[PDB]
Amino acid sequence: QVQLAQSENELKKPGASVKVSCKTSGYTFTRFGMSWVRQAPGQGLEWMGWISGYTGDTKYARSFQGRLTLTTDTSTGTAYMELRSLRSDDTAIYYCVRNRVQMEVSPATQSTWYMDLWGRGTLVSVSSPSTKGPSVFPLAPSSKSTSGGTAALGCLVKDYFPEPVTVSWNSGALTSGVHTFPAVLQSSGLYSLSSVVTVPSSSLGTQTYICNVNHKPSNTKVDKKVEPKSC
Amino acid sequence: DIQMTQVPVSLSAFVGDRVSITCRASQDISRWLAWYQQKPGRAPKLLIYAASSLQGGVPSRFRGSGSGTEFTLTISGLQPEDFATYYCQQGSTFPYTSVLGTILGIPGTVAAPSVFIFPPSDEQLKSGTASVVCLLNNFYPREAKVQWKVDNALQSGNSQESVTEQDSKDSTYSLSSTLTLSKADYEKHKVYACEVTHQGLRSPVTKSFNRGEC
Amino acid sequence: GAIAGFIENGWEGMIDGWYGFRHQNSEGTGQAADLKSTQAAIDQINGKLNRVIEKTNEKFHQIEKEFSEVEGRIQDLEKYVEDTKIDLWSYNAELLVALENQHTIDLTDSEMNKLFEKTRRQLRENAEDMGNGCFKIYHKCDNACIESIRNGTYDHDVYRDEALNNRFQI
Amino acid sequence: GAIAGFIENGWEGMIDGWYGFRHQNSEGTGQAADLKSTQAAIDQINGKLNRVIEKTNEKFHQIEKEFSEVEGRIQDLEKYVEDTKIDLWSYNAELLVALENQHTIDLTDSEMNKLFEKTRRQLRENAEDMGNGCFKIYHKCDNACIESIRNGTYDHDVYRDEALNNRFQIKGV
Amino acid sequence: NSTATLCLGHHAVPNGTLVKTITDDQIEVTNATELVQSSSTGKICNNPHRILDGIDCTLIDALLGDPHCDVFQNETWDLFVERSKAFSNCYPYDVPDYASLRSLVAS
Amino acid sequence: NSTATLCLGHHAVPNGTLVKTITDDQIEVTNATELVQSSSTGKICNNPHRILDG
Amino acid sequence: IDTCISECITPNGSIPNDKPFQNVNKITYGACPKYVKQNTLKLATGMRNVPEK
Numbered sequence A: 001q002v003q004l005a006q007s008e009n010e011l012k013k014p015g016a017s018v019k020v021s022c023k024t025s026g027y028t029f030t031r032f033g034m035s036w037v038r039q040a041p042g043q044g045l046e047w048m049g050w051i052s053g054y055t056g057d058t059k060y061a062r063s064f065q066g067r068l069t070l071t072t073d074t075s076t077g078t079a080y081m082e083l084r085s086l087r088s089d090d091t092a093i094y095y096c097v098r099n100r101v102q103m104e105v106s107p108a109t110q111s112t113w114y115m116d117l118w119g120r121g122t123l124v125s126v127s128s129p130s131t132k133g134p135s136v137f138p139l140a141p142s143s144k145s146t147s148g149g150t151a152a153l154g155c156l157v158k159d160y161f162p163e164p165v166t167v168s169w170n171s172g173a174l175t176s177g178v179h180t181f182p183a184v185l186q187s188s189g190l191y192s193l194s195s196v197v198t199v200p201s202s203s204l205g206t207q208t209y210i211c212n213v214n215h216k217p218s219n220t221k222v223d224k225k226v227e228p229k230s231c
Numbered sequence B: 001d002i003q004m005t006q007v008p009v010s011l012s013a014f015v016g017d018r019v020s021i022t023c024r025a026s027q028d029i030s031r032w033l034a035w036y037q038q039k040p041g042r043a044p045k046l047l048i049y050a051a052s053s054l055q056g057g058v059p060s061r062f063r064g065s066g067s068g069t070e071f072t073l074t075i076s077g078l079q080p081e082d083f084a085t086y087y088c089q090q091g092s093t094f095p096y097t098s099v100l101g102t103i104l105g106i107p108g109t110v111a112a113p114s115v116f117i118f119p120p121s122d123e124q125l126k127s128g129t130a131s132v133v134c135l136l137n138n139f140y141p142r143e144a145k146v147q148w149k150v151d152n153a154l155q156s157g158n159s160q161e162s163v164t165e166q167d168s169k170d171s172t173y174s175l176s177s178t179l180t181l182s183k184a185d186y187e188k189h190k191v192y193a194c195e196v197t198h199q200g201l202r203s204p205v206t207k208s209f210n211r212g213e214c
Numbered sequence C: 001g002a003i004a005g006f007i008e009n010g011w012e013g014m015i016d017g018w019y020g021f022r023h024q025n026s027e028g029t030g031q032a033a034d035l036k037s038t039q040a041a042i043d044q045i046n047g048k049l050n051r052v053i054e055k056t057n058e059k060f061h062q063i064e065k066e067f068s069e070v071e072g073r074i075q076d077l078e079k080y081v082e083d084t085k086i087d088l089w090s091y092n093a094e095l096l097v098a099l100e101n102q103h104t105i106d107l108t109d110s111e112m113n114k115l116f117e118k119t120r121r122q123l124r125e126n127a128e129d130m131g132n133g134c135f136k137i138y139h140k141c142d143n144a145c146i147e148s149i150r151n152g153t154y155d156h157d158v159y160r161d162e163a164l165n166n167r168f169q170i
Numbered sequence D: 001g002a003i004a005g006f007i008e009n010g011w012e013g014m015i016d017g018w019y020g021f022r023h024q025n026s027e028g029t030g031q032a033a034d035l036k037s038t039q040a041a042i043d044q045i046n047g048k049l050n051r052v053i054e055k056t057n058e059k060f061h062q063i064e065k066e067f068s069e070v071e072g073r074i075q076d077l078e079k080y081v082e083d084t085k086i087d088l089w090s091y092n093a094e095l096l097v098a099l100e101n102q103h104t105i106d107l108t109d110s111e112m113n114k115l116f117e118k119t120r121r122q123l124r125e126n127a128e129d130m131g132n133g134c135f136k137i138y139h140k141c142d143n144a145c146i147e148s149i150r151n152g153t154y155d156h157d158v159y160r161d162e163a164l165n166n167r168f169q170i171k172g173v
Numbered sequence E: 001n002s003t004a005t006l007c008l009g010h011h012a013v014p015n016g017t018l019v020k021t022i023t024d025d026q027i028e029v030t031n032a033t034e035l036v037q038s039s040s041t042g043k044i045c046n047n048p049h050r051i052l053d054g055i056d057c058t059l060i061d062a063l064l065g066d067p068h069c070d071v072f073q074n075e076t077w078d079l080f081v082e083r084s085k086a087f088s089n090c091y092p093y094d095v096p097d098y099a100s101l102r103s104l105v106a107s
Numbered sequence F: 001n002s003t004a005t006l007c008l009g010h011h012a013v014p015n016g017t018l019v020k021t022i023t024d025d026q027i028e029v030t031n032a033t034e035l036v037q038s039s040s041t042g043k044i045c046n047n048p049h050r051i052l053d054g
Numbered sequence G: 001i002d003t004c005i006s007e008c009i010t011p012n013g014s015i016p017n018d019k020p021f022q023n024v025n026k027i028t029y030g031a032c033p034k035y036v037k038q039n040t041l042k043l044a045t046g047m048r049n050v051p052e053k
């Protein structure tokens, strides 16, 4: 089995630099090349550069004229990328991809010529504020028995940084009707998101619903409950 | 550098339909292009290499065509797993270049949104900030207009929306608009409401709430 | 146990690359591959291999090429047209590989000579061409000195006085 | 501000010719084109350009190549014969240009090396190949001396003793 | 010692492949690839082209509507495959310019 | 100066034409000429051939 | 007929289209290699082989 194990997600400030690594497995690191491509949130793919596992020769994109540097360690067989002078725009998920064959003749009619093997990806976040845990708030069902037939309740995960935040309901018991929304960037530079679920109105009084929020960067594990407010 | 141009950018086709995606090159590529599939929340996957060669495990409905500078990807007999974002890539010369890509959505039947309103809780007012949210559940198509109204006072430069990706069975969308103000600003007005406009509704439906009361 | 260069032979025991170096010095013998010249040769072969298999001649409905019965004049023409086509393409195929092979043999021999001249240029007056694809370096060149030649950072002025002394004085 | 030769570099600021010289001496820097080597390369390109266009295929009455209606067996043959013809000529065209281009690139690179060797022959033991397409001339070579190298009248014996002393010295000759 | 030796060389293989050039019929090289396909699996791949097996029917028999060829009514194809075992089982007929009609319908 | 430097070189262009060879699909060259006619005036020349309009 | 994938089809069965030429059959369908009379044409993918080590 062939695998590309990447390094953990990183949080950095404007300026400075990052060094993302990518450990190779199941194939000879030499006799192959490595490409690096990134994807900004909601945007398409952007090719950054390529490096030979055999010769060490590099090919860079015009955008990364002197900001990107690709290096390699033949033994142990791992590949690195270094991006200097970081900006808010550089916030993206960075993929490491096996791309070309080296030390042997191979035509472009082969899958190996193209970007054959992808890594899971590595998120790097460039922002000025420090790591901060989320603030969970209760979202109660309003009005007279909501619509009448179906009801909705939720949890508001507000003010946290950086992404991601995991959320589940009743520790994975309640899945149907659940809608966890993608996070939105605030003016302050912090992230916020909401998670909701549709249930029968009759179940509000009898059934109990718990949202389990997890934020690994700040190590914040919160379990909050919501039911109709006592007016 | 070789600029790649993907034409459809956004696309809607129901299951069992045939759909065509185009990629035109700035220069002669001569067959050496590749197509990639990227499902939401996952990494890209190689679909076909060269002009037409399918990757191992790829069905057969996907058919690649082209040479020189004109290339196309067509998907026949659409299935739910085929709905993703697609990218072509030239491998003729460095620098290698991907594209803007084509997003694939599912057009089912028209479904009106379930509009709900939720006031800010008492824990939130302690922080000194208060947020109002208008929730739209399970609807199609995506283009839906949302406007906030505070005691008949126009809102602008104070709200942000978020949309979910297409879910698995009902094939509809969900949206959440969120308006945020300080405690001081929240204390000035009584009536708060969100007006929604969508193809499923004949008239804009309004869910509202008055402050001080539930 | 003298070492020999590319003129008389090739090196069977060499897996790291296509072209390389072999040395004999104060710290003993050694060997190393030249990776850039190796990949350069391969890149060229990839290029022509790609061109010969570029274009896919996609053909659908064509004329009949086999006949169960004797018809006459039109049949003879159909047979002639195809027989003509095949002979012409068979010629093109025979010629193409011959031209490609000759060129491949030349460009690979060219890479060897370019590497030899690159090295000759580095050593300047500190060495002499023994004629068998080897250089007699006229100064104490330890393993680090050899690597500097291989990675292209050899400074001849450092060893010039020592070398010129060993070359001319008898 | 060292000068560099032809190895992995070209000279953008060059209008008098295709190949040339660039120098650094007592009287400062300078540049000049080599006209004969330039014209020699061009003469060769003219030659092959002439040959590719030397025949004029004059053709008059031919077969029909477009058809308004579906006829049958004869039509299919006429289409096949022409489709075959076009494929064979399209191959010949693709191959010809490839072979001509490769040769043009080789003969132009060859012309550069011939000029380098011609110069190397002139200087004899009065200079050394620095390796970047340049010569280190080991004697005071003013503008007139450079000019003599360029116009092929350089007498090495005149500067031999001066040069050999500068080349082979450990401290004192 | 006071000197050193530096030799330059290229790799070789115990037994290489023979190829042809403009001057030589047989030159040994370290590696080569075949450019002529001479082998077949013996079977026809049902993908990517839509293959239609005629079995006992010919294209014309199917066109006219021979009783045992009724399964081919309104049938479509990319390649129609005609078998040698095929036979006619209707009214005896001839088709002047058979080849043209066969080619026409096939297209 | 007691010494001098003499470099040999060739000219170059800010932007050249791409051509094809036996090994390369795209190699930049200083100059090139088109060998395929792809344009027409849209009109038929009455000379040198005697043309008869039906 | 069999369940598998191949662009080129001949009366002898399907054949791979990886090579530029083929010797199987002048009759073809799809993206096929050009028919030639030769049964073998070897293209050098390496330098000339010399024996000593």
Ligand SMILES: *[C@@H]1O[C@H](CO)[C@@H](O)[C@H](O)[C@H]1NC(C)=O
Residues within 6 Å of the ligand: A104, A105, A106, E013, E030, E031, E032, G045
């Ligand atoms: C010949 O080339 C093929 C393809 O690059 C390679 O797999 C094989 O190992 C090579 N053989 C030799 C002897 O170099």
Ligand SMILES: *[C@@H]1O[C@H](CO)[C@@H](O)[C@H](O)[C@H]1NC(C)=O
Residues within 6 Å of the ligand: C143, C144, C145, C146, C147, C148, C151, C153
């Ligand atoms: C070349 O090798 C020497 C050691 O012999 C080392 O000091 C030097 O840094 C190397 N240069 C490069 C570019 O690898």
Ligand SMILES: *[C@@H]1O[C@H](CO)[C@@H](O)[C@H](O)[C@H]1NC(C)=O
Residues within 6 Å of the ligand: D143, D144, D145, D146, D147, D148, D151, D153
């Ligand atoms: C070459 O140049 C020198 C001056 O540097 C001049 O004296 C000599 O006559 C010239 N020879 C020719 C043939 O032009």
Ligand SMILES: *[C@@H]1O[C@H](CO)[C@@H](O)[C@H](O)[C@H]1NC(C)=O
Residues within 6 Å of the ligand: E014, E015, E016, E028
């Ligand atoms: C392969 O090795 C050499 C290649 O030069 C040849 O002489 C020998 O006969 C061959 N042996 C076999 C067993 O093929």
Ligand SMILES: *[C@@H]1O[C@H](CO)[C@@H](O)[C@H](O)[C@H]1NC(C)=O
Residues within 6 Å of the ligand: B001, F014, F015, F016
């Ligand atoms: C010259 O051509 C390349 C592509 O062939 C182009 O990208 C570049 O911008 C051009 N340079 C100038 C100075 O026009």
Ligand SMILES: *[C@@H]1O[C@H](CO)[C@@H](O)[C@H](O)[C@H]1NC(C)=O
Residues within 6 Å of the ligand: E038, E039, E040, G011, G012, G023, G024, G025
């Ligand atoms: C292909 O089939 C024909 C008969 O149609 C036969 O004559 C020929 O020998 C076969 N060739 C191969 C390579 O199977």
